[PDB]
Amino acid sequence: ASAFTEGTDYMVLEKPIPNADKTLIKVFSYACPFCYKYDKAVTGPVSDKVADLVTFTPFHLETKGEYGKQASEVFAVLIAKDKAAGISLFDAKSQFKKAKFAWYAAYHDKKERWSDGKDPAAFIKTGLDAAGMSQADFEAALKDPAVQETLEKWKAAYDVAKIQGVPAYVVNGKYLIYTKNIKSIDSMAELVRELATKK
């Protein structure tokens, strides 16, 4: 039927993310501990359960941390590359996934700060080395118009992140899930399916 409750399980965004129908967007930051937690355990299984209905669509939040935009640039490049190649963003071979988890580990587990903003080379190296992509290949791919448009789209992440922090899971660009009220993977997957099929 309909099992979930407006104002508790989810809310409608005042300003929807445009051009996002049939997506599960996850607004996240490399510098976000709960993003790491959810990425390790929840994001994959939930996305798998709803993959027949919505496409998993990461949105990186550039405003958080000293290297938010550098991370966004790398992620945008790596997602574009993975998707060109037909590789799932949860596949062991995903370059996006490798970079993402390398940064999560460095930042959250090893408390790496790469000289507090002054060493973007060192920051980018952590992600690119994990992904197996060269500095030169990254700077060249950054120029791709579709990558630049991804970066423009992700500017929308800030107003969504403000509401209840990150991670912020959004369905069809319209319905924001309350992270603190997520009960389980099985529950969240049904919540996403319910939201995805709203008129």
What features would you describe in this structure?
This protein has helices at residues 33-41, 43-50, 68-84, 95-109, 120-131, 135-141, 145-153, 157-164, 185-196; strands at residues 10-12, 23-28, 55-60, 168-171, 175-177. By secondary structure, the protein is of the alpha+beta class. It has a 5-stranded mixed beta sheet, sandwiched between helices. It is classed as oxidoreductase. The entry lists the keywords thioredoxin-fold, DsbL, thiol-disulfide oxidoreductase, Isomerase, oxidoreductase.
CATH class: Alpha Beta
CATH superfamily: Glutaredoxin
Q: Count up the helices.
A: 9
CATH topology: Glutaredoxin
Number of domains: 1
* Strand runs, count: 5
Query: Strand portion, in percent?
Result: 5-15%
Helix percent reads 40-55%
> What is the CA–CA distance across the termini?
14 Å
By CATH, the architecture is named 3-Layer(aba) Sandwich
In one word, what is the shape? Answer: globular
In terms of structural class, how would the helical and strand content be classed? alpha+beta
Q: Over the alpha carbons, how many angstroms does the gyration radius reach?
A: 16 Å
Main β sheet profile: 5 strands, mixed
H and E string: EEHHEHHHHHHEEH
Strand order of the largest sheet: 1-5-4-2-3
